[PDB]
């Protein structure tokens, strides 16, 4: 069971180089039966393939990105990497790393290789902008009137940039009733979202509720106690 | 360097059978392997068909792939259509020059029950007020179909500016979520008797009210 | 003179179930792989890390042949990297696999009007099989680690039969598979092509 994890800068200034790393586990990047590639998806749009590589260093590129693309493997860390130089706003996308279906020869001797994607990574959101990163202001949304045999309590994540943030509750120990709403993009160019959790009305006295906000592009974590 | 063309969207009732087609512009569709990828809202894509008709483990037996060279096209076919199959579907192939992706087909399952929204309205926190800021958070969940309008009120009179409202987005249960934020000064919050979020969906209206405390 | 016995692998009368797959080590003969790649009767013919087309020019230490029956939709799991019930629990190719995967439809031999239930597969185990591992056991599988004396709840028969019907769809039809694995160790070359 193979897993793939992208890591990247989150925000990158125009004309600079976007640098991304995919970390393989459950398999080795050294395995010469497979290729390994990068796919991107700008917000609102579909998919575009970038480049693929195998252990030797043999490489296939999208011809429209090739003069700006460098892809390498690092067998010493079980990783492969993508660099995309001179970024503009058209390179704002979610970037996905992936492993292809294995290369093989047919009965005639034709070599099928790098034709399609089999295991996908989770994606890494990349924003290209001149604006600076901004960590979030985290405020509690206390329970009050929270109508029912249950109660709603929340966590407001205000005025951050760029996307994304992740919210968990009680370090992941609480999953049921959790609803993280999509972010609003305000007129200032900053983002805000909220995360609520529906809890039992009786359990407000005994159980304490922390939302764990994480904003990786500004290297911030906030554990915010929410209290009656 | 060819292109592949997909319908922008596709609609079918549950239990019925639906087919998304993918038509190659030049060359033969049979010369190169065709893949199909499924993408739910918020998720990475998942491969559901490879090598025109091979189905990876975990994809239901109801998903099937096929090639039709007389129309130069490939086809994803979902039999016994379920609510859980609502997603975007992308075809993908390649030649010697590049991979080529379809533009994607939004698959809509029809006959879904109309559901009116639940609305939760929160006042500013004392922590936010005591930093000279005030935000009202209106959260709108579990509604179908995905079109609401939100109107804010100050003391029965409508509020024009300082309102930010998201566009409705698909949840995992195929109903929709939205949210709206009203920014106020701390004085505006206390100088009014109450503020209201008013959500209108399919002619009906759900209104919540919060007041200083 | 030393014609390698691929004909007794491929043209053998009976094949085994996939959970109880069978191995024939082949060495110390001369091989003619052109018997394989001349033919047009294979439905699956995939070679990884080596072309079929160039096999008559190579020399190998040991060639192994592994054989079993799967239903048609399960032939895709006999490939490097794949998962599913056959790869996880019955037969597993390694990631760095060198060899070929060869399959042909046998609905005329291995199906029936009433149903052929002779071919079994394992569907649950404690762990995934390692490459080229084999599980022949007839135990009751407990998910926790309890003793089970009868197949019950939380006491699982881990084996199920394919049911092969002659009128079935081609993905539910029986397919014989032969997996050819090639080694060439620091060992001297025992198997060679004609050239
Ligand atoms: C199996 O038999 C057929 C004819 O009966 C023959 O043509 C074929 O080459 C044989 N297979 C092998 C591997 O010798
Ligand atoms: C083939 O047969 C000859 C005759 O005995 C023998 O010397 C040789 O070792 C055999 N094997 C090969 C690979 O030539
Ligand atoms: C097919 O026949 C034999 C297979 O044993 C092989 O030696 C021969 O070269 C092949 N010829 C062609 C034309 O494929």
Numbering used by the authors:
A (entry chain H): 1 to 35, 35A, 35B, 36 to 82, 82A, 82B, 82C, 83 to 100, ...
B (entry chain L): 1 to 26, 27A, 27B, 28 to 66, 66A, 66B, 67 to 210
C (entry chain A): 333 to 527
Publication passage describing the model:
Here, we report the isolation of three mAbs that broadly neutralize sarbecoviruses. All three antibodies recognized epitopes within the receptor binding domain (RBD) and inhibited the binding of soluble human angiotensin converting enzyme 2 (ACE2) receptor to the S protein. All three antibodies recognized a region on the inner side of RBD that is hidden in the RBD-down conformation. Thus, they can only recognize RBD in the up conformation.
Given the binding breadth exhibited by 10-40, we conducted additional structural studies for this mAb to investigate the basis for its cross-reactivity. To this end, we determined crystal structures of the 10-40 Fab bound to the RBDs of the sarbecoviruses SHC014, RaTG13, and WIV1 at 2.2 Å, 2.8 Å, and 3.1 Å resolutions, respectively. As observed in the complex of 10-40 bound to SARS-CoV-2 RBD, the majority of interactions for 10-40 with SHC014, RaTG13, and WIV1 were through its CDRH3 and CDRL2. We found that additional hydrogen bonds and salt bridges were present between 10-40 and these three sarbecoviruses as compared to SARS-CoV-2. Specifically, though the 10-40-SARS-CoV-2 interface involved 10 hydrogen bonds and three salt bridges, there were 15, 14, and 17 hydrogen bonds and four, three, and three salt bridges for 10-40 with SHC014, RaTG13, and WIV1, respectively. These additional contacts may explain why the potency for 10-40 against SHC014, RaTG13, and WIV1 is greater than that for SARS-CoV-2. Among the four complexes of 10-40 with sarbecovirus RBDs, there were a total of 12 interactions (nine hydrogen bonds and three salt bridges) that were conserved in all of the complexes. Such extensive overlap suggests that for mAbs that have deficiencies against some of these sarbecoviruses, engineering of similar interactions could help to improve their breadth.
